[PDB]
Write a protein that binds this ligand. Structure first.
Ligand SMILES: Nc1ccn([C@H]2C[C@H](O)[C@@H](COP(=O)(O)OP(=O)(O)OP(=O)(O)O)O2)c(=O)n1
Ligand SMILES: [Cl-]
Ligand SMILES: [Cl-]
Ligand SMILES: [Cl-]
Ligand SMILES: [Cl-]
Ligand SMILES: [Mg+2]
Ligand SMILES: [Mg+2]
Ligand SMILES: [Mg+2]
Ligand code: NA
Ligand code: NA
Ligand code: NA
Ligand code: NA
Ligand code: NA
Ligand code: NA
Length: 326
DNA sequence: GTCGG
DNA sequence: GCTGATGCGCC
DNA sequence: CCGACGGCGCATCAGC
């Protein structure tokens, strides 16, 4: 909450730009400024001071000066008073409704949860699930519950094949006291960059987790990525646990370090790390780090034996997972 | 919106 | 069906 | 209409 006012303002502007303006690069510019400001170890006392930071320019510095002088931003006052903008922003909170579908729904008079519930026939399966569990998906998951969830997942995966290794990533791996959802990175020796020596490696795991009633709904599913819904079991007389979002990603076993780096995040850390790789002459994805050639083309994958090796290539001091949060 | 070629 | 674009989502 | 900006999986649609 050092500079909390400012980073909250910038985050609200980011979400407006993404969700209402459909300006993804302005969204990213506000996210980067908010990130650099949140890590700054002093109280910001002027826009000029802020402007010294990378990603803060003239326009954001002017907003910082207004906020600092008044405790508000007139631009955000106006946005919050705009019913249309507020409804569009709100609908994007439903899983499976993005900025385009939100604008379409709002253009047709669908502006509230009640409206969506009355017009379910206009929603695809994903969106119906997002609507059904809307309240539940708004809630964070206490780390204590993430531990029970981890226990179930690792137990069931072991049952299918003891050679699978499942690693809970995302904010959990970063040490967070609560998480938005569960992210599971999966490997198996039969799936590498060289071969797929077994079929349906992800399917087998998903199927076992459905058999024991942990996974309750599927949003999307291909050969390497599963996106769905799960729920802890609860006791008699007791309030049910909320349904939770779960993501499972099967990554080639020989590309585990790029995979776990990607899946640990945070999102802004990843984008910032990948941006630094580009200015250092490299490109990073969840599979590989490659050098860039004269044609801007990525060359062959470089050898990696740890998360730190990836940091080494781009001359960043190693950051532990807990220091990768915003 | 910011930065850099 | 394909390629390529768009829309959803993930970190 | 300076253009890049991090990078990609899954689902669906446009123009073949
Ligand atoms: N930092 C910038 C600023 C502008 N442009 C673009 C905008 C124009 O399409 C083109 C040339 O525009 P100008 O005529 O504004 O650039 P000059 O250098 O000719 O302007 P001046 O007459 O001020 O020197 O470059 C650019 O690539 N990079
Ligand atoms: Cl944009
Ligand atoms: Cl769907
Ligand atoms: Cl790797
Ligand atoms: Cl690759
Ligand atoms: Mg997560
Ligand atoms: Mg997730
Ligand atoms: Mg997230
Ligand atoms: Na700056
Ligand atoms: Na959404
Ligand atoms: Na356990
Ligand atoms: Na599907
Ligand atoms: Na239920
Ligand atoms: Na090293």
């Amino acid at each position: 909450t050092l500079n909390g006012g400012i980073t909250d303002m910038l985050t609200e502007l980011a979400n407006f730009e993404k969700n209402v303006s459909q300006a993804i690069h302005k969204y990213n510019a506000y996210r980067k400024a908010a990130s650099v400001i949140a890590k700054y170890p002093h109280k910001i006392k002027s826009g000029a001071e802020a402007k010294k930071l990378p990603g803060v320019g003239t326009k954001i510095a002017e907003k910082i000066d207004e906020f600092l002088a008044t405790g508000k931003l007139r631009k955000l006052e106006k946005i919050r008073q705009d019913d249309t903008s507020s409804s569009i922003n709100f609908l994007t909170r439903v899983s499976g409704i993005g900025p385009s579908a939100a604008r379409k729904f709002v253009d047709e008079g669908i502006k509230t949860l009640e409206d969506l519930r009355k017009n379910e026939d206009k929603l695809n399966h994903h969106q119906r699930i997002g609507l059904k569990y809307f309240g539940d998906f708004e809630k964070r998951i206490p780390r204590e519950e993430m531990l029970q969830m981890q226990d179930i997942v690792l137990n069931e995966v072991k049952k299918v094949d003891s050679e699978y290794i499942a690693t809970v990533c995302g904010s959990f791996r970063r040490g967070a006291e609560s998480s938005g959802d569960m992210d599971v990175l999966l490997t198996h020796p039969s799936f590498t960059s060289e071969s797929t020596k077994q079929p349906k490696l992800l399917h087998q795991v998903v199927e076992q987790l459905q058999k024991v009633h942990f996974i309750t709904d599927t949003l999307s599913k291909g050969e390497t990525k599963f996106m769905g819904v799960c729920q802890l079991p609860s006791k008699n007389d007791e309030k049910e646990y909320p349904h939770r979002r779960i993501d499972i990603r099967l990554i080639p076993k020989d590309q585990y370090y790029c995979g776990v780096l990607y899946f640990t995040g945070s999102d802004i850390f990843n984008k910032n790390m990948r941006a630094h790789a580009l200015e250092k002459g490299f490109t990073i994805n969840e599979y590989t780090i490659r050098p860039l050639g004269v044609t801007g083309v990525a060359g062959e994958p470089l050898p990696v034996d740890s998360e730190k090796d990836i940091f080494d290539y781009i001359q960043w001091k190693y950051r532990e997972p807990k220091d990768r949060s915003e």
